[PDB]
Design an enzyme around this catalytic site. Structure first.
Site, short mmCIF file in Angstrom:
data_model
loop_
_atom_site.label_atom_id
_atom_site.label_comp_id
_atom_site.label_asym_id
_atom_site.label_seq_id
_atom_site.Cartn_x
_atom_site.Cartn_y
_atom_site.Cartn_z
N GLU A 36 0.81 -1.19 0.00
CA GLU A 36 0.00 0.00 0.00
C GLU A 36 0.86 1.26 0.00
OE1 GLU A 36 -3.98 -1.47 -0.33
OE2 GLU A 36 -3.06 0.51 -0.56
N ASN A 47 -7.38 10.66 -5.25
CA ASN A 47 -8.13 10.02 -6.32
C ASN A 47 -8.99 11.04 -7.06
OD1 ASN A 47 -7.35 7.25 -5.57
ND2 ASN A 47 -8.48 7.67 -3.72
N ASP A 49 -12.16 10.67 -7.77
CA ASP A 49 -13.52 10.66 -7.24
C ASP A 49 -13.68 11.61 -6.07
OD1 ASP A 49 -12.35 9.26 -5.10
OD2 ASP A 49 -13.35 7.36 -5.58
N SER A 51 -11.98 11.45 -3.24
CA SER A 51 -11.46 10.83 -2.04
C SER A 51 -9.94 10.75 -2.09
CB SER A 51 -12.05 9.43 -1.84
OG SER A 51 -11.44 8.52 -2.75
N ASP A 53 -6.55 8.52 -0.14
CA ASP A 53 -6.08 7.40 0.69
C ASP A 53 -4.90 7.89 1.51
OD1 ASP A 53 -7.87 5.74 -0.80
OD2 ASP A 53 -6.27 5.54 -2.34
N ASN A 60 -9.10 5.05 3.11
CA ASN A 60 -9.79 5.97 2.23
C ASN A 60 -10.80 6.88 2.98
OD1 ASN A 60 -12.40 6.19 0.18
ND2 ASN A 60 -10.44 6.44 -0.87
#
Length: 130
Positions: A36, A47, A49, A51, A53, A60
């Site tokens: 990760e 991201n 969208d 969001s 991480d 997220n």
């Protein structure tokens, strides 16, 4: 801006009770963090969208932590996302335990599913002082 070593992270995760948490041996958790974030506590992935991480386990902001920017936020870990960028892994571990506990398995982590599941995950703790 702490980047963990493999064995150092395994020991920290063990101290926080992740070894065999909900049936997932410690090597799964170390493997997930490796792929990760490559053990970087500051890792951030923003991201398209809306969001983001955050941190060593790339948790997220739509369902798990609040960054105030993300549509549809649920904040199920009840924490600001900035808590997940600390050098201290406490908030990340506590929220990871919630993720698993709120129905998900470790399949919640795309890197676990794609790079750890089915492998000899004990290799990620081999040779470490635990």
């Amino acid at each position: 801006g702490k980047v963990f070593g493999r064995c150092e992270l395994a020991a920290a995760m063990k101290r926080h009770g992740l070894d065999n948490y909900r049936g997932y041996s410690l090597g799964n958790w170390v493997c997930a963090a490796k792929f990760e974030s490559n053990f970087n506590t500051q890792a951030t992935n923003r991201n398209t969208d809306g969001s983001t991480d955050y941190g060593i386990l790339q948790i997220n902001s739509r369902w798990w932590c609040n960054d105030g920017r993300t549509p549809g936020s649920r904040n199920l870990c009840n924490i600001p996302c900035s808590a997940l960028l600390s050098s201290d892994i406490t908030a990340s571990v506590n929220c990871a335990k919630k993720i698993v506990s709120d129905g998900n398995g470790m399949n919640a982590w795309v890197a676990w599913r794609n790079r750890c599941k089915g492998t000899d995950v004990q290799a990620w703790i081999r040779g470490c002082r635990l």
